[PDB]
Design a protein around this ligand. Structure first.
Ligand SMILES: O=[P@]1(S)OC[C@H]2O[C@@H]3[C@H](F)[C@@H]2O[P@](=O)(S)OC[C@H]2O[C@H]([C@H](F)[C@@H]2O1)n1cnc2c(ncnc21)NC/C=C/CNc1ncnc2c1ncn23
Lengths: 174, 177
């Protein structure tokens, strides 16, 4: 199936390479780049998985209570003949009553865009669920996923994306 | 099937975004006189598609007659909540008798690595089937796409260890000139 392949591709071509190095890049940002009075960036990569596969290019659109702060120090690797392929990740402030309630490295699972660009709304929802299911199995079995990665799967019906992420962020400090 | 999805992902998540901008980035590189003196870069993205799905991280590794020269001016775009995702491509000198015979933007189709990882230890026959489907699916997508306008050449091949990757590329490169 398609979503089987995209989920494995997403692990093998991305998560496998960046998750081992993520904590060091977040440590680096907190200790050097992060402003004196700004909250610490949390230690986990939060991956948004909208089951409708609607992936906007900017998260401020999906919820204005999600505010882009800064980029992490970038990671590079020689891969498939491409010298210094750049792995960049963006930091987001999650706002509650116009004030920062949390900070995290936050992004959509890009391959959901490929399902969206592809044959019905119902069949797409089944592939999106399979993508999530398949990725959950890969990361539950992977040495690189050591509670440094949280999948946030959700169906939009009124909805708060910022509150959905903040729920996950609060569960991790415990 | 798997290879159907990876081929579409490779177009939608990469080729669709970079092929419209590619000629302008190669034009920019060739307009710098000191670049052009070493040799003009060809106007197409050359994509290697080994059907055995063996994708090494370095092209010098696969064949030392392929020598990394420089990176292209990089392209950026805000995509899936990642601000300024960097689209980088590498320029390579292709040697014949220790002399430059060509310069081109060259890379492996990365998703072949996912097929290889899935079946390095299902089967070597099923891997060859999926690799062929990946190539055939991408061939169809680009034949029908407005972004593929003689600015992208697929190089599918099988290794027989009496092979020259540099000569394989130069054959394709010379036909496009
Ligand atoms: O839909 P996508 S963005 O594209 C599929 C395909 O398109 C090709 C490549 F062949 C892909 O497959 P793969 O390498 S096995 O990655 C499979 C998924 O992992 C995910 C992402 F979901 C990938 O799927 N992934 C990979 N890299 C990457 C990343 N930032 C965030 N997510 C990333 N930063 C590194 C550099 C990104 C820009 N530069 C690129 N250079 C070359 N080829 C490229 C780039 N971006 C794409 N592609």
């Amino acid at each position: 199936s398609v979503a089987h392949g995209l989920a494995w591709s997403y692990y093998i071509g991305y998560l496998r390479l960046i998750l081992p190095e993520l904590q060091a890049r977040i440590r680096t940002y907190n200790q050097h780049y992060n402003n004196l009075l700004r909250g610490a960036v949390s230690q986990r990569l939060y991956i948004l998985l909208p089951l409708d596969c609607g992936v906007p290019d900017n998260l401020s659109m999906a919820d204005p209570n999600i505010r882009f702060l800064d980029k992490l120090p970038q990671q590079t690797g020689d891969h498939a003949g491409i010298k210094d392929r750049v792995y960049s990740n963006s930091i987001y402030e999650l706002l509650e009553n116009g004030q920062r309630a949390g900070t995290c490295v936050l992004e959509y699972a890009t391959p959901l865009q490929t399902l969206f660009a592809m044959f019905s709304r119902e069949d797409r929802l089944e592939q999106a669920k399979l993508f999530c299911r398949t990725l959950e199995d890969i990361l539950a079995d992977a040495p690189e996923s050591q509670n440094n990665c949280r999948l946030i799967a959700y169906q939009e019906p009124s909805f708060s994306l910022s509150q959905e992420v903040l729920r996950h962020l609060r569960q991790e400090e415990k």
